[PDB]
């Protein structure tokens with residue numbers, strides 16, 4: 001939700017951001033908002049004018065009681081004032097609802113540091129890490145996407161796609177999943193199940209060492225926490241609702257974590273509040289029904305360890321920068337070459353002010369694919385969930401800033417490990433850092 | 448689902464099992480199904496008779512063609528025949544629908560060793576284990592449920608309830624979960640989160656060592672897998688259905704595990720199929736909205752590692768014994784005193800033929816509570832999901848038996864650990880077998 005103040009004190013700033021975002025059909029809203037806001041104030045100033053009248057008409061009927069008191073009229077003038085006052089109050093009431101309806105439907109104001117663009121093609125790579133293994137046949141695409149700034153090694157043989165690897169590795173059964181649940185669902189098997197759990201613990205241990213409190217939240221939440229966490233467009237495209245209940249399957253632990261302190265006033269002496277949640281994630285993925293990679297890259301359910309941060313507005317950006325690096329550290333230990341990208345205005349989303357994504361190099365796919373995302377939501381969720389804080393128990397509480405970032409979403413971490421650590425025969429070596437969690441050091445094909 | 452052949456050949460047998468189950472109403476169904484089945488079987492005969500009669504009349508009306516051909520009579524007949532075949536055919540389909548309606552709502556035939564009883568009160572203790580710590584104020588109930596066949600020791604202090612321990616230990620937030628999702632939801636925090644994952648991993652390893660193939664299934668399934676794993680009653684009381692989708696949140700890994708091989712003819716050579724699934728579980732828990740224990744003992748979501756077995760009928764009973772013991776073994780290492788009860792007809796349920804439960808002694812509560820349950824479903828699920836096997840491609844395929852059993856449901860295992868391992872000051876000592884998974888050897892209080 002956007003702060004009506006910000007709109008009153010800079011409609012042009014919002015209209016232009018609305019354009020950098022591509023939300024052109026919504027700039028007209030800026031005006032609509034202000035003219036309503038204006039009307040709201042006018043009716044309010046009339047109510048005061050009227051309350052004051054109520055008073056004068058009052059002292060009068062009295063001042064006339066000690067006189068001829070023909071106050072029969074003033075009594076009628078009084079009855080209409082309360083009538084008007086009510087009408088106005090109700091009118092003001094509705095006027096606020098229309099204002100808020102637009103406010104809840106407006107994307108966060110982007111930071112000046114986010115590049116301007118149309119879509120994912122415009123995101124801007126700002127950093128690379130690792131020695132990518134590239135197939136002779138992807139050499140150009142790689143060099144273009146890496147801008148030549150990344151260390152690589154050419155591969156003789158053609159690296160396989162993760163879906164095929166899971167197969168030769170006996171790690172999954174897609175067909176039976178389709179019979180039981182439908183498309184984009186799956187059964188994970190053997191070593192892959194241990195690897196999944198292992199990735200959760202690894203992620204979990206590290207954020208804990210960095211001081212984040214580990215939480216397992218509710219996987220189903222009430223509607224207000226979903227609408228307080230993202231744009232309403234998500235109820236159609238991504239969020240599953242359960243019949244006959246005010247319960248929605250969470251698409252990320254981010255949401256229940258942000259709901260965890262809805263309607264509170266935190267004590268500044270506690271910030272930053274650091275949470276690291278684990279939870280299955282459920283997504284309709286309606287926009288597609290089958291795009292390309294047909295394994296566990298884009299599915300209906302996946303596990304994800306999430307970093308969530310409550311901070312003072314003055315600390316958010318520094319935190320945005322810390323969490324993204326927390327995620328980067330994991331993949332480096334996991335030995336996954338990648339590139340972090342600054343998402344542009346057109347691919348940014350409604351909730352974020354700025355967003356960094358980690359796109360891992362996928363040897364088999366011949367490309368970089370998103371594997372984690374860190375967003376600074378500033379006060380957007382806060383204003384919605386009413387999450388404020390105060391330092392001195394006598395001052396006006398201010399909204400806090402919220403931030404979230406993937407630590408590890410097992411689904412993709414697994415495709416990245418399978419595609420980046422595969423050997424010609426299909427054998428997949430497990431990054432040394434996970435050995436303490438898996439037991440085995442590699443997964444060999446079955447026969 | 449019960450076999451129509453069983454009802455025909457042995458109606459008395461099923462009536463008696465029903466009476467023994469005290470399903471006094473359904474007993475009438477046996478005769479009803481029989482009555483409809485005979486009509487159904489007759490009309491089927493009628494239809495074949497008529498079809499053959501129609502042909503003999505088709506060749507004959509054409510025979511009179513080369514003769515006087517006063518076929519204007521046979522013609523009228525051939526029309527009565529097709530009219531009858533049509534009428535019959537519909538009566539048949541209707542008959543099948545009424546018959547299946549009953550076949551699908553009939554409980555499984557209990558094994559003669561299942562004791563008769565009205566509810567869980569009549570459930571029978573068949574074995575005990577461990578040394579229980581008992582509060583003096585709970586001595587009667589303890590001896591009552593222990594039959595005085597279990598070693599123990601009296602505590603002069605009152606051991607606390609897990610809900611309280613969770614609070615003094617800083618491992619959960621219930622108030623916020625209620626804000627965010629409603630009651631019987633929760634946020635697990637700090638070392639309780641690690642303990643939760645550590646229990647899943649511990650169960651997985653032990654079951655893997657025993658050769659079960661580990662699996663992570665779909666958390667949402669199509670209605671048929673649900674209708675194939677339990678009685679329809681469950682749709683009202685337990686299973687959450689997702690809006691506008693033929694998808695249902697699973698109440699246990701057992702269901703998709705059973706659905707995994709629906710409509711297949713396994714190769715006898717592969718039997719037994721041993722699966723150990725992990726997954727979150729969702730239950731409506733309709734019969735309640737408030738009962739007694741207010742922690743994580745009876746909630747809407749919890750994690751659970753489940754044992755599932757696809758078996759040859761002649762091996763199912765030996766397996767029912769091996770899996771309950773696998774669970775016992777886990778709780779013994781976890782050092783939780785307990786008793787295992789053979790479940791009676793009234794607390795048995797629709798899909799099991801026989802069932803054992805492991806009830807953990809709960810120091811704070813002063814009683815034994817169900818922590819794991821194991822069943823042999825024989826061919827009940829198999830008949831519904833159409834799961835068969837054959838040893839030779841020649842032979843007619845026959846139904847397999849299925850069995851399921853808890854390994855560890857983290858929720859109740861955590862209450863058992865908290866209550867049986869607390870100390871006077873409130874800290875809880877984690878059993879040694881888990882150290883390799885939790886790191887920490889115990890959880891101490893906070894301010």
Ligand SMILES: Nc1ncnc2c1ncn2[C@@H]1O[C@H](COP(=O)(O)O)[C@@H](O)[C@H]1O
Pocket residue numbers: 251252283285296297298299300301302304370371372373406409411412
């Ligand atoms: N449909 C999906 N299937 C598997 N993983 C996903 C899916 N959607 C998102 N993810 C993972 O969750 C991360 C964060 O997603 P978001 O919650 O969309 O920022 C993505 O970078 C992926 O690692």
Ligand SMILES: Nc1ncnc2c1ncn2[C@@H]1O[C@H](COP(=O)(O)O)[C@@H](O)[C@H]1O
Pocket residue numbers: 698699730732743744745746747748749751817818819820853856858859
């Ligand atoms: N609503 C619940 N909340 C927490 N744990 C449960 C719940 N229902 C069942 N359990 C656990 O799951 C085990 C097996 O239950 P069942 O699937 O009903 O055979 C029980 O013995 C408990 O340990």
